[PDB]
């Protein structure tokens, strides 16, 4: 009986400007991280995965290398967002950014994604 | 037509047709449910035994009593007892027969009301009534005035009556009776190296209470003499063939009625309780109550209880008064025989709560018509 | 100690472990099991060069048990083999271990409550007829807990090897009629664990084997906090499975039996015993007490005896009391329960028959000790 | 448990040593006197032998059991030799040749049960042990010769030879080696 | 339903097949399966693993005891199923060949040995529901059925529904008390002594003495002498003295036929006759680590049962399974219990000064002809009833829950 009742409880203007690396540098300006908002977090990703898919493989190396250490850590949080619901083939591109990003950031850039208490 | 008299006391249920001289059926108010999983598919069907089956099968059953201290505590089990009473024990269907139930004083009114609701809604009786158990005991004696003492299994109470007028302010009650006397015996046998603990074995400790215990006429002399010799060391058999034998435990249990401090209750004993109730009565009644103490109920069956009680009141009351104790031989059935007399009475045939009155007023009618 | 320089000793006479020390010591000096036994030749064992006396006793009889037919002289708090009982004390006070070796120094005895009177009296005989002790006292086993804990009001839960007791004490008054026993103790949990491992296909049957499953019990078992959560974690995942090494080196593996065995304290119907679990027997005791005293017993539950050591038992016990109070006192008025101040004294030190309060605070020199008479 | 433990330890009998010295009925010579009744510790070990060897556990109930377990081991050693005998006559003399062999006395090393038998403390026990344990063996052999060889053909009788493989709780009076 | 339910009882020695309502099992067969063999084609590259349809070339029962070109396997040991691959192949051929049953249209009653682990009740249920699509299964406690077989056979004046059953089949012996139709699960005991270990003891006891027995047939002859010549004796050492003095006549002769050469061979049969059955009374003869005589294990059971039922349990002990058939096996167990029980009462006389004499317990041990199949016959009389069809698990319940519908057991 008794024991049953529990108790105890702007980006487009840089992209079409050709030097689209300047767009990605701009895409990192909109983190929702500190906010309590949730619809904005769905907007934040869509503004970046549209960018990630645009790169030629001739550039995806420098597009990582031109980031600062925060930039790589920032990027990895966007990478692990696209994997949560892939596009019809875009996983083929995220896994290619991941290759470059992990080369720059090392596994340490993953760990402060796993431990990130507030996120984009 | 004929009324049914049904003493739904705690302990032993008693039922039978009014006007008969002794109950047609008596059986224990216990409901027995199996304490091991039912697995011999076939004969081993019943999910809840009641009465004499449960008392018999007790080895495999967790017995429980649905009346605690005179207050009904599990109504689903109680309904099974009444259902057992009518359809199996009396073998008379309730729809044709008005029922005299009976109850202890100062019970919660919810007990009286729900007992009536069950009677009209489930068993569909023609009519019913709820007498207080004490005045029924006074009827059985053929007595116009006396102080009734019912000592049941779960309640002991005094009701003083004069010229058939009751004295409500002098009614007093004690929740110590044959059950707690048994639970105390089930302790003090451990002093001697036995052990009874299961609910079935509590039925064996009751049995020995009935056969061997007696009230001491001089308790301190009895203690001192019990230490002298094995002259008290009566012997009794368990169902296993183990033999147990008992000394001063024989009287220490009965004595609890006169010294409730043994079970740690603060109330005075039955003797001082009886005298206290007479001292509440109006002064000219008192002399006549002293001549008409009437004992009732099984707990008053112990050898020497009438004499011990006489001695105590004779010391406690004024020395010119002639204390006498009416202890009828049949006093175990006194309540039921009293009901059988009332349900035969030509005047009482107006007093029923008739069905249409409950249909009008609902359960609260019991407080209008019943005492 | 005495102004005469005499020393004073406490023996718990425990049903499973004798526990001994001098007055005022915060620790027992010697803990040893009450085994007494005789040499037996066994085919399954190489007979060593180690000398076996014609009666091994105590700690020695536990380590060399592989050659020994062992008895417990004490069962359920009653001496059932009085000769081995004498030999166990004759070992305790001899040159080995607590070498007082003398009549002159005092001994305290601890008796369970509701103890068959002849058991008590034979101890008081042999202490004065055989050791001829100069000073003896028999103390209420329940009060010694509160002396050691430094309290005067509270309800003592005292699950030893032999029997479990509950005894309220209110501001030092003994309330006897609120005593209760529950016949579940460390020995029955062990036998029940034997049966649970028998289902997993390990056979244990020698008297020497009983000590081994006791050592299993003490190291792997625990009491489930939310028994539904334990069952799901057993069903869903493997982590509860853990190894143990028997004396012969068999690497046996034990699983959900780690919690299914201790649970019997809360569910006596898993063993043959018909009754209520420790929490509900504790709750009914408080509820029987006089109405104003209940307010303090809920705040001063006190735990004693080795069978209370099981990981999580205080937490499990507190849960069942809160839920019982919600169900039967607050009548499901859940949010009110924030007002129910309940507290369990569960100090990690819990061989809780230590002697400081019972001896030195009771006598340095006094007429209280019974004496040669 | 219900293995056959030694019956003869009537307290009126002398109890020299760590074992019941007992009145071995024989025409050999030794420290023990002559029993006159028809039953004796060597006859007891012989009688219970076929049962005792199956019981895989055996207590020492009293001092006489530390005798009986040794007599049993020597009886086994008799069978370990008589089985080879070509006839009963050899079965007697080739048994006497066994009795006077230097068996490890229980306190001597290489005896299998040194945990169970205390050391003999002095010559007047040790030399008594030499003079008692031979008197056991010398007699024990001559009793088996009469009843292992069934009289039709002085074959060593099959039923007895079955037990050659079985040893009382798997202990051997060969010790760690002969 | 119209078609009868199947009752399939599987033991470690034998299995017992037939449809419910029959009075008697329609097949009794040994619990053996003879799988195909190879000249080390199975090896470290792969062990006993088949291809194509090579796995269906096997047989079970007596069709598998005497085939030369197959390796005999025994899937059930100590009553527990040890290798479910072979057991599932065994079940298939039971159903689709021996019983001719379509599993999709007959209820199954199938037996639990009271020791078995819950995982084995999952796996056995996974077979019948998920491999065979049985419409409903029930897993019955073997001992309770054995009592029902006594109950319907014995006279109506003593159909007590109360007794202790001793079920010494092969594998392990169960001692189980039933009071008024309820299993007292707390008191069940298991004794490891059983028909296999009595066989093995006799096999060793022969092979030490009586070499000449060909290695292919040692087991067969050990079984024969166990079945044909063995008896429970009155006093162990008194038999050894009788066998020595009257060795002309207590000794017996068994003649066997050589399976290969068809020459006969003979062995002298002797101490084998009373060793063996006395392993129940001296379990340490066969196991290092069990020692209580069966006559003292059965006492502990009743003495743990509730005080009221104790005497009735002594009044009605039922013997079940084949090993309990040994000559005098009832007589001795009754004598040992009687000698124990009335001596226990002699104590409680003296603790009361002889002032009262207790009504002595009579003890009865009951042998009845069903003993070789009382478990199946009980099963048949259960599975006949219309009640049985509602106690079974309907297949949908296996869909909604997992196989976990068989985790529960009444112990
Ligand atoms: N000699 C006796 N015979 C029968 N009952 C006795 C005797 N002595 C004591 N009793 C007790 O009396 C009680 C029965 O009383 P009961 O008829 O139930 O009263 P009520 O029905 O008014 O509650 C039982 O507890 C029974 O054990
Ligand atoms: N750490 C532990 N965990 C679980 N059980 C334990 C632990 N320590 C001791 N026990 C058990 O407690 C019992 C002994 O407790 P103890 O207080 O000495 O009893 P007693 O004093 O009555 O002999 C034994 O069953 C022992 O196995
Ligand atoms: N005449 C007999 N005497 C003694 N035991 C027998 C006899 N005949 C058969 N047996 C034993 O009965 C067993 C038959 O199988 P049984 O034990 O009934 O089923 P299960 O295989 O379920 O245990 C045989 O293995 C054998 O051990
Ligand atoms: Mg009454
Ligand atoms: Mg203790
Ligand atoms: Mg079987």
């Amino acid at each position: 009986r008794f024991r049953k009742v529990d108790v105890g409880e702007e980006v487009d203007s840089c992209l079409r400007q050709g030097n689209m690396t300047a767009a990605l540098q701009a895409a990192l300006k909109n983190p929702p991280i500190n906010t309590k908002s949730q619809a904005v977090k769905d907007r934040a990703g869509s503004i970046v995965l549209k960018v990630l898919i645009s790169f030629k493989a001739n550039d995806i190396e420098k597009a990582v290398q031109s980031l600062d250490k925060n930039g790589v850590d920032l990027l990895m949080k966007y990478i692990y967002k696209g994997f949560e619901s892939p596009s019809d083939n875009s996983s083929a591109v995220l896994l290619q950014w991941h290759e470059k990003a992990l080369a720059a950031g090392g596994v340490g850039s993953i760990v402060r994604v796993l431990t990130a208490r507030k996120t984009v | 037509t004929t009324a049914l008299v049904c003493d739904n006391g705690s302990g032993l249920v008693k039922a039978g047709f009014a006007g008969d001289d002794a109950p047609r059926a008596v059986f224990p108010s216990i409901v027995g449910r199996p304490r091991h999983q039912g697995v011999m598919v076939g004969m081993g069907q019943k999910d809840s035994y009641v009465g004499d089956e449960a008392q018999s099968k007790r080895g495999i059953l967790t017995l429980k009593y649905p009346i605690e201290h005179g207050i009904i505590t599990n109504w689903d089990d109680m309904e099974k007892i009444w259902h057992h009473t009518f359809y199996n024990e009396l073998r008379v269907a309730p729809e044709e027969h008005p029922t005299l139930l009976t109850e202890a004083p100062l019970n919660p009114k919810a007990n009286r009301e729900k007992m009536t609701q069950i009677m009209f809604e489930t068993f569909n009786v023609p009519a019913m009534y709820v007498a207080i158990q004490a005045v029924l005991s006074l009827y059985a004696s053929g007595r116009t005035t006396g102080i009734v003492l019912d000592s049941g299994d779960g309640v002991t109470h005094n009701v003083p009556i004069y010229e058939g007028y009751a004295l409500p302010h002098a009614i007093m009650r004690l929740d110590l009776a044959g059950r707690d006397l048994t639970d105390y015996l089930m302790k003090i046998l451990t002093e001697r190296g036995y052990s009874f603990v299961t609910t079935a074995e509590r039925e064996i400790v009751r049995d020995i209470k009935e056969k061997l215990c007696y009230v001491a006429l001089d308790f301190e002399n009895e203690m001192a003499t019990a230490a002298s010799s094995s002259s008290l060391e009566k012997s009794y058999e368990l169902p296993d063939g183990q033999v147990i034998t008992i000394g001063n435990e024989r009287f220490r249990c009965p004595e609890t009625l006169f010294q409730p401090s043994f079970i740690g209750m603060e109330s005075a004993g039955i003797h001082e309780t009886t005298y206290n109730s007479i001292m509440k009565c109006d002064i000219d009644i008192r002399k006549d109550l002293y001549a008409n103490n009437v004992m009732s109920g099984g707990t008053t069956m112990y050898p020497g209880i009438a004499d011990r009680m006489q001695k105590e009141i004779t010391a406690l009351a004024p020395s010119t008064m002639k204390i006498k104790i009416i202890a009828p031989p049949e006093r175990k059935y006194s309540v039921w025989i009293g009901g059988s007399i009332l349900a035969s009475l030509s005047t009482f045939q107006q007093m029923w709560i008739t069905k249409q009155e409950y249909d009008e007023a609902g359960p609260s009618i019991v407080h209008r018509k019943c005492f | 100690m005495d102004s005469q320089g005499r020393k004073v000793v406490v023996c718990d006479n425990g049903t499973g472990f004798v526990k001994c020390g001098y007055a005022g010591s915060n620790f027992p000096e010697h803990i040893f099991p009450a085994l007494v036994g005789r040499p037996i030749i066994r085919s399954t064992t190489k007979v060593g060069n180690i000398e076996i006396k014609d009666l091994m006793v105590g700690d020695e009889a536990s380590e060399l048990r592989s050659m020994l037919e062992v008895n417990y002289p004490m069962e359920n708090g009653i001496v059932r083999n009085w000769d081995d009982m004498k030999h166990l004390w004759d070992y305790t006070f001899g040159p080995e271990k607590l070498n007082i070796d003398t009549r002159n120094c005092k001994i305290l005895l601890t008796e369970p409550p509701m103890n068959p009177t002849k058991n008590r009296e034979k101890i008081v005989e042999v202490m004065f007829e055989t050791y001829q002790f100069s000073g003896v006292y028999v103390a209420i086993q329940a009060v010694l807990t509160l002396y050691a804990q430094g309290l005067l009001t509270g309800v003592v839960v005292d699950s030893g090897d032999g029997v479990t007791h509950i005894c309220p004490v209110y501001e030092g008054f003994s309330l006897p009629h609120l005593t209760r026993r529950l016949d579940i103790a460390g020995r029955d949990i062990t036998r029940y664990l034997i049966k649970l491992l028998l289902l997993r296909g390990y056979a244990f049957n020698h008297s020497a084997d009983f000590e081994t499953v006791r050592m299993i019990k003490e190291k792997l078992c625990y009491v489930g906090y939310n028994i539904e959560q334990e069952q799901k974690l057993a069903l869903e995942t493997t982590v509860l499975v853990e190894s143990y090494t028997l004396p012969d080196g068999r690497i046996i593996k034990v699983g959900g039996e780690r919690f299914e065995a201790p649970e019997a304290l809360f569910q006596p119907h898993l063993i043959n015993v018909e009754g209520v679990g420790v929490a509900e027997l504790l709750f009914n005791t408080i509820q029987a007490a006089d109405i104003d005293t209940r307010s303090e017993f809920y705040k001063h539950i006190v735990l004693s005896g080795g069978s209370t050591m099981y990981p999580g038992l205080p937490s499990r016990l507190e849960r069942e009391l809160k839920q019982l109070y919600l169900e039967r006192v607050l009548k499901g008025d859940v949010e009110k329960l924030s007002k129910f101040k309940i507290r369990i004294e569960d100090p990690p030190r819990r061989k809780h028959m230590v002697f400081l309060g019972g001896a030195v605070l009771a006598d340095i020199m006094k007429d209280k000790d019974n004496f040669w008479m | 448990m219900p293995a056959y433990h030694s019956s003869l330890m009537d307290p009126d009998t002398k109890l020299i040593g760590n074992m019941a010295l007992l009145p071995i009925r024989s025409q050999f010579k030794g420290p023990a006197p002559r029993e006159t009744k028809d039953t004796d510790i060597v006859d007891e070990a012989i009688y219970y032998f076929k049962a005792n060897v199956f019981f895989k556990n055996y207590e020492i109930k009293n001092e006489a059991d530390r005798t009986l377990i040794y007599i049993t081991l020597y009886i086994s050693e008799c069978l370990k030799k008589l089985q080879k005998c070509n006839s009963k006559s050899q079965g007697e003399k080739e048994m006497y040749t066994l009795g006077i062999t230097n068996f490890p006395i229980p306190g001597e090393p290489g005896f299998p049960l040194n945990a169970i038998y205390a050391k003999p403390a002095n010559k007047q026990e040790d030399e008594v042990m030499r003079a008692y344990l031979q008197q056991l063996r010398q007699e024990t052999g001559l009793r088996l010769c009469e009843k292992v060889f069934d009289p039709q053909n002085d074959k060593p009788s099959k039923w007895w030879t079955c037990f050659v493989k079985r040893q009382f709780m798997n202990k051997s009076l060969s010790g760690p080696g002969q | 339903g119209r078609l009868p339910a199947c009752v399939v009882d599987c033991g470690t020695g034998y299995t017992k097949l037939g449809y419910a309502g029959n009075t008697e099992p329609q097949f009794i067969i040994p619990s053996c399966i003879a799988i195909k063999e190879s000249a080390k084609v199975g090896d470290q590259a792969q062990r006993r693993v088949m291809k194509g349809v090579d796995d269906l070339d096997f047989f079970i029962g007596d069709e598998a005891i005497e085939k030369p070109t197959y390796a005999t396997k025994w899937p059930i040991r100590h009553g527990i199923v040890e290798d479910w691959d072979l057991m599932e192949r065994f079940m298939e051929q039971v159903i689709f060949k021996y019983l001719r049953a379509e599993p999709e249209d007959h209820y199954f009653l199938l037996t639990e040995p009271p020791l078995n682990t819950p995982e084995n009740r999952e796996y056995t249920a996974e077979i019948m529901f998920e491999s065979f699509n049985v419409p409903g299964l029930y897993i019955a406690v073997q001992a309770v059925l054995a009592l029902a077989a006594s109950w319907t056979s014995r006279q109506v004046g003593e159909r007590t529904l109360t007794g202790t059953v001793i079920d010494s089949g092969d594998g392990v012996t169960h001692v189980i008390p039933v009071a008024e139709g309820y299993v007292i699960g707390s008191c069940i005991k298991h004794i490891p002594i059983a028909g296999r270990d009595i066989t093995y003891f006799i096999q060793q006891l022969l092979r030490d003495r009586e070499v000449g027995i060909p290695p292919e047939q040692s087991l067969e002859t050990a079984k024969a002498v166990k079945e044909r010549y063995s008896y429970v004796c009155p006093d162990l050492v008194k038999e050894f003295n009788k066998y020595d003095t009257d060795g002309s006549k207590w000794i017996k002769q068994y003649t066997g036929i050589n399976a290969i050469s068809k020459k006969e061979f003979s062995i002298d049969v002797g101490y084998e006759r009373f060793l063996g059955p006395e392993i129940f009374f001296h379990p340490e003869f066969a196991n290092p680590d069990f020692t209580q005589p069966i006559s003292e294990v059965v006492d502990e059971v009743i003495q743990n049962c509730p005080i009221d039922v104790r005497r009735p349990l002594y009044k009605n002990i039922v013997l079940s399974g084949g090993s309990t058939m040994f000559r005098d096996f009832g007589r001795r167990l009754q004598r040992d219990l009687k000698r124990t029980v009335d001596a226990r009462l002699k104590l409680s006389e003296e603790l009361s000064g002889g002032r009262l004499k207790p009504k002595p317990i009579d003890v009865q041990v009951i042998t009845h002809h069903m003993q070789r199949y009382a478990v199946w016959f009980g099963g048949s009389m259960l599975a006949s009833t219309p009640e049985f069809y509602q106690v079974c698990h309907t297949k949908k319940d296996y869909e909604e829950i997992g196989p976990s519908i068989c985790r529960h057991n009444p112990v």
Side-chain angles (χ1 to χ4, degrees), chain B residues 34-41 43-44 46 57-60 201 204 233 235 237-243 245, chain E residues 144 147-148 151 161 179-184 303 306-308 310-311 345 348 352 355-356 358-359 361 382 410:
Chain B
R35 85 172 177 107
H36 306 287
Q37 186 179 348
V39 293
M40 192 178 197
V41 178
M43 302 297 290
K46 289 172 172 172
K57 291 178 191 283
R58 62 181 179 234
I60 55 162
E201 290 161 325
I204 300 167
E233 205 192 51
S235 305
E237 293 189 69
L238 310 193
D240 193 20
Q242 302 178 42
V243 179
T245 179
Chain E
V144 186
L147 182 64
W151 186 96
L161 302 166
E180 301 206 52
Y182 291 80
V183 170
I184 303 166
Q303 297 288 336
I307 191 169
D308 288 292
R310 295 180 184 179
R311 177 183 280 128
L345 301 176
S348 299
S352 185
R355 197 175 304 121
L356 184 148
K359 179 68 169 68
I361 295 182
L382 172 55

Side-chain angles (χ1 to χ4, degrees), chain A residues 26-28 30-35 37 39-41 43-45 48-52 54-57 60:
Chain A
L28 299 189
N30 191 22
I33 291 169
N34 185 251
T35 75
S37 71
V40 183
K41 294 199 186 83
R43 186 169 67 214
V48 178
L49 189 145
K50 180 56 60 179
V51 176
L52 293 176
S54 71
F55 284 75
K56 299 285 295 187
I60 193 163

Side-chain angles (χ1 to χ4, degrees), chain C residues 12 14-15 19 141 160-161 353:
Chain C
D12 303 1
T15 295
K19 297 177 280 288
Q141 174 179 305
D161 199 48
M353 300 286 94

Side-chain angles (χ1 to χ4, degrees), chain A residues 3-9, chain C residues 266 319-320 322-324 326-327 337:
Chain A
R3 64 182 56 103
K4 185 178 179 177
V5 182
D6 296 331
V7 175
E9 299 190 306
Chain C
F266 294 84
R319 189 176 67 79
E320 295 245 348
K322 279 174 167 170
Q323 295 186 210
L324 279 163
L326 175 60
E327 178 186 275
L337 187 66

